[PDB]
């Protein structure tokens, strides 16, 4: 089975760089080239270079002119970029791909020639704010018995840095009608994103709801409950 | 540098039609191009190779086709997993080069929002800030219009929307609208309300709520 | 047990590229490759695969070919336009090979040299070409020395007296 | 010592393969690829072309309509296999000018 | 027939269309290399092999 | 601000001609394009140009080509003669035109090389090669001297002395 | 100065054309020719053949 093992998620300020690394298995470094692609969120795939395990060779983008390098460790077999002089644009989802043959004579026909094995990727995050954990607030039903037949309620997980955030409903016992929106940046640099559930008016008093929010990098666990407000 | 241009960027088809994707290239290619498809939250795959070799595991339906500077990539008889944004890439020369790429959505019957409003909680007032939101569940088409309006004060330079990817059964989309405001200015006005515009209604349906009151 | 180079033969004991360097030092014998000749050979390679390859002729409905009656002149016709196209494509394609086969005998045989001169340029007057496709190195060159040389970094002004008195006093 | 050698060489293997150039009908080399196909597996893909098998049936024997010919009734192909084995079994007929109508209907 | 995919069809079977020339058949269809008289053609991808070591 | 040559390296501001030599020394630096070698390669492009435009495929009455109709059997046989013709000559040019360039880029480069290497015949022992296109030319050599190595009228015995001098010296001669 | 230095070179162009060998699909070259005719007048010339216009 073949691999590649990215480094871990990194948060860094404007200005600074980053490494990202790629470890290489279930096929020889050598013999083959690397590829590095990056997809800031809701934009399409950049190619940023490409680099010979064999030769070390090295071929960039104009876009990153002098701002990024590619290098090579052949044993260990694994890859790095660097990309310096970093910029609130620069936040993105960076890929290491297996991408030429080398020290072989090898057509285009293959489809080694092209970008044959992807990473599961890597987040890189620019902004000036440190690391903090989300804010959660109680959601209720409002209303006389909201619309009468279905019903809705959720909790808002806000002001947190950086993505990503996880969460559930009843530890995974409820999935139907549950919709996770995706996070929007607030003016203030942080994220801030809403979930929530429909289910019927009828088991409000008696079914009992509770959503488990996750945030890794501040490492805040938390299990808030919603049910409708004594007024 | 080889410019690459996909020309559909957006597209609606309901299962079993057949769709065709174009990518035409700045110079002659001649042939060495790739497809790639991305899944809503997954990395690229790669589909096809060359302009018409089929990747091992990959169906039959999608088919290449291609030479020189015109190239084209159709899916017949679709299927669920077929909905993705699809890449076309050059690999006759450095700088090898991506595109805009083409999102892959799914028009089935129109189907009108279920439009809810939801308060402020009490535990947010102590913050010394305030956020309204109208969600919009369950529908289609996704070009939906919210405006939010406060003792009837037009609203601008203050909200931000978010909408979900295309679910799995019922193939329609949910949207969420969130107005940010200050404690002191939401001691200012007592009715707030968000209109939503979308082509299952007739007119524009409001849901509003009053202050001090539940 | 004295090293030879290219002239009279090849190295058969070589997995890591296609030219490379052997040496004969005060720290013993050693090898290595020279990785991007190799590279830059395969690449042209690469690239008239890749031409021979280019264009798929896709053709669809065409002449009958084969013929289970006689019928006469038409038929007659039919069979000679594809006798005629047959022999076209066979000379093209035997033709082809051949001019390709030479071109590659070439431009293999040239980065050999290319990397010889790389080599005769850096060392300038500190070495003399012993004919075989070997240096005689006239000074003290340990194996890092033997490394800037491999590597494009050896500075002849560093090793030339010494060289140059090495060369000349009897 | 006060002197060192450095030099220079290509790789070679053990048996290499034989090619031809312009002047040379035998020339080893350390590797080479056959660009002539000559091997057939001896069967018919049934992608990506839509295949029509005719079986007992011609393409003129279907497109009249006879009667072990019903099946291909409104029936279209990317390419239409016609056997050996095929025969005819309606009233007896003659076709002048067959090539050019079965290539017609073929196309 | 058989369940599998190939450009190229011959009535001796379908053939990949990996090679730019073919010796099979001179019927065809498809994607197909072009017929040949010759039923092989090696290309060099490699130096002149010389034997010591 | 050192000179280089023709390894790796292209000249941008260049007018006179297609080759040329630059140098740098007493009375500062300076260019001047090489006449004959320019020509001499133009001469040689030329040659080929006229050779691929030399015959005139001079022709009359032909068979039909385009058809409104569909006829049979004799139609599907004037279309596939004439789509044969087509491929085969569409053949003949892209191998061509391929077959050329790669002579004109081997014909143009050799004749950079012819030009290094009269160059050195030229110097003898007074110069060495520093490995980018360049000559260390090992004597005070004025611009009347640079003018007699490119107009082919350098005397190395002139000047060998002198160069062997500051050639071979581990501190003194 | 008591030496001096003596680079040979050839020219180049701010932005050349790209041409085709039997090695590279692209390589950039400082001058080329076509040899493809693929435009025309859209009249027909009366001269040197005897035209008749039916
Ligand atoms: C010949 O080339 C093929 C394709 O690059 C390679 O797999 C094989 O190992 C090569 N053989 C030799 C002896 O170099
Ligand atoms: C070349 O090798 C020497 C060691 O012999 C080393 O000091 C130098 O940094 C190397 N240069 C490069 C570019 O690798
Ligand atoms: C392969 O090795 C050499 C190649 O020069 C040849 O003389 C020998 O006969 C060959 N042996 C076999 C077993 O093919
Ligand atoms: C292909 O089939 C023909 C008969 O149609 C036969 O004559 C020929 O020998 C076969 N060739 C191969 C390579 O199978
Ligand atoms: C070459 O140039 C020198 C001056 O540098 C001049 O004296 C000599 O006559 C010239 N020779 C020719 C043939 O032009
Ligand atoms: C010359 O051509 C390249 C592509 O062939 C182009 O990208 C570049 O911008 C051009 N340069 C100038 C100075 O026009």
């Known amino acids: 089975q073949v691999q590649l093992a990215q480094s871990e998620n990194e948060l860094k300020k404007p200005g600074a760089s980053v490494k990202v690394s790629c470890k290489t298995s279930?096929?020889?470094?050598?013999?083959?080239?690397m590829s590095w692609v990056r997809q800031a969120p809701g934009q399409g795939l950049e190619w940023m270079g490409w680099?010979?395990?064999?030769?070390?060779?090295?071929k960039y983008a104009r876009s990153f002119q002098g701002r990024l390098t590619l290098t090579t460790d052949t044993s260990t077999g694994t890859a790095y970029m660097e990309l310096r002089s970093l910029r609130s644009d620069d936040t993105a989802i960076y890929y290491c791909?297996?991408?030429?043959?080398?020290?072989?004579?090898?057509?285009?026909?293959?489809?080694?020639?092209?970008?044959?094995?992807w990473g599961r990727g890597t987040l890189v995050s620019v902004s000036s704010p440190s690391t903090k954990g989300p804010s959660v607030f109680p959601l209720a039903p409002s209303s006389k018995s909201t619309s009468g037949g279905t019903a809705a309620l959720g909790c808002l997980v806000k002001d947190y840095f950086p993505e990503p955030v996880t969460v559930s409903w009843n530890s995974g016992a409820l999935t139907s009608g549950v919709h996770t929106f995706p996070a929007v940046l607030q003016s203030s640099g942080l994220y801030s994103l809403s979930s929530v559930v429909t289910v019927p008016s009828s088991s409000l008093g008696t079914q009992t709801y509770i959503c488990n929010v996750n945030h890794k990098p501040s490492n805040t666990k938390v299990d808030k409950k919603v049910e409708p407000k004594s007024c | 540098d080889i410019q690459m241009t996909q020309v559909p960027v957006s597209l609606s088809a309901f299962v079993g039609d057949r769709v065709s994707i174009t990518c035409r290239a700045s110079q002659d290619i001649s042939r060495w191009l790739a497809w790639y498809q991305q899944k809503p939250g997954r990395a690229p795959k790669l589909l096809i190779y060359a302009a018409s070799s089929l990747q091992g595991g990959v169906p039959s339906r999608f088919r290449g086709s291609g030479s020189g500077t015109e190239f084209t990539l159709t899916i017949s008889g679709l299927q669920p997993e077929d909905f993705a944004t699809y890449y076309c890439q050059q690999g006759s020369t450095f700088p090898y080069t991506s595109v805009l790429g083409t999102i892959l959505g799914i028009p089935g019957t129109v189907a009108a929002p279920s439009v809810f409003i939801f308060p402020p909680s009490d535990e947010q007032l102590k913050s010394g800030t305030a956020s309204v939101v109208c969600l919009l569940n369950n529908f289609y088409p996704r070009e939906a219009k919210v405006q939010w309006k406060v003792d009837n004060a037009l609203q601008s330079g203050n909200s931000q929307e978010s909408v979900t990817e295309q679910d799995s059964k019922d193939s329609t989309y949910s949207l969420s609208s969130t107005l940010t405001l200050s404690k002191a200015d939401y001691e200012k006005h007592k009715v707030y309300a968000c209109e939503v515009t979308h082509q299952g209604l007739r007119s524009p349906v409001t849901k509003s709520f009053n202050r001090g009151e539940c | 047990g004295a090293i030879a180079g290219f002239i009279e033969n090849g190295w058969e004991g070589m997995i890591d590229g296609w030219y490379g360097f052997r040496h004969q030092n005060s720290e013993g014998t050693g090898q290595a490759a020279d990785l991007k000749s190799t590279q830059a050979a395969i690449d042209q390679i690469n690239g008239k695969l890749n031409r021979v390859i280019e264009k798929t002729n896709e053709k669809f409905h065409q002449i009958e070919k084969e013929f289970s009656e006689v019928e006469g002149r038409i038929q007659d016709l039919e069979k000679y336009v594809e006798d005629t196209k047959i022999d076209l494509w066979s000379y093209n394609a035997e033709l082809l090979v051949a001019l390709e086969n030479q071109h590659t005998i070439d431009l293999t045989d040239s980065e050999m040299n290319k990397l010889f001169e790389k080599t005769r340029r850096q060392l300038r007057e500190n070495a003399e070409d012993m004919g075989n496709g070997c240096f005689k190195i006239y000074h003290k060159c340990d194996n890092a020395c033997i490394e800037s040389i491999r590597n494009g970094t050896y500075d002849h002004d560093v090793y030339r007296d010494e060289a140059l008195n090495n060369r000349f006093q009897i | 010592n006060s002197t060192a050698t450095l030099c220079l060489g290509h790789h070679a293997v053990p048996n290499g393969t034989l090619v031809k150039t312009i002047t040379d009908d035998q020339i080893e080399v350390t590797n080479a690829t056959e660009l002539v196909q000559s091997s057939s597996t001896g069967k018919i893909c049934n992608n990506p072309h839509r295949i029509l098998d005719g079986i007992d049936c011609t393409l003129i024997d279907a497109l009249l309509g006879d009667p072990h010919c019903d099946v291909f009734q409104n029936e279209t192909w990317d390419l239409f296999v016609e056997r050996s084995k095929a025969f005819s079994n309606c009233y007896p007929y003659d076709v002048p000018d067959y090539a050019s109508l079965r290539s017609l209907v073929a196309s | 027939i058989d369940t599998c995919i190939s450009e190229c069809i011959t009535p001796n079977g379908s053939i990949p269309n990996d090679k730019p020339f073919q010796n099979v058949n001179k019927i065809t269809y498809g994607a197909c290399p072009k017929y040949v008289k010759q039923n092989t053609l090696k290309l060099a991808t490699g130096m002149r092999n010389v034997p010591e070591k | 601000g050192a000179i280089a040559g023709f390894i790796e390296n292209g000249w941008e501001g260049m007018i006179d001609g297609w080759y040329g030599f630059r140098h740098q020394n007493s009375e500062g630096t300076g260019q001047a394009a090489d006449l004959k070698s320019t020509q001499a390669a133009i001469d040689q492009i030329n040659g080929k140009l006229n050779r691929v435009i030399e015959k005139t495929n001079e022709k009359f009455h032909q068979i039909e080509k385009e058809f409104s109709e569909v006829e049979g059997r004799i139609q599907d046989l004037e279309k596939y003669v004439e789509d044969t013709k087509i491929d085969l000559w569409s053949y003949n040019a892209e191998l061509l035109v391929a077959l050329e360039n790669q002579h004109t880029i081997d014909l143009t480069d050799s004749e950079m090389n012819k030009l290094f290497e009269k160059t050195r015949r030229q110097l003898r022992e007074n110069a060495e090669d520093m490995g980018n296109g360049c000559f260390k030319i090992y004597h005070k050599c004025d611009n009347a001297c640079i003018e007699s190595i490119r107009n082919g009228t350098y005397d190395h015995d002139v000047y060998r002395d002198e160069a062997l001098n500051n050639r071979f010296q581990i501190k003194g001669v | 100065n008591s030496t001096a230095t003596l680079c040979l070179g050839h020219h180049a162009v701010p932005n050349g054309t790209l041409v085709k060998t039997i090695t590279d699909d692209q390589i950039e070259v400082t001058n080329a020719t076509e040899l493809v005719q693929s435009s025309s007048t859209g009249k027909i010339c009366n001269n040197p053949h005897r035209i008749l216009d039916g």
């Open positions: 791909v297996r991408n030429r043959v080398q020290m072989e004579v090898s057509p285009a026909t293959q489809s080694t020639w092209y970008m044959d094995l």
């Open positions: 279930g096929y020889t470094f050598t013999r083959f080239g």
């Open positions: 680099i010979s395990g064999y030769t070390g060779d090295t």
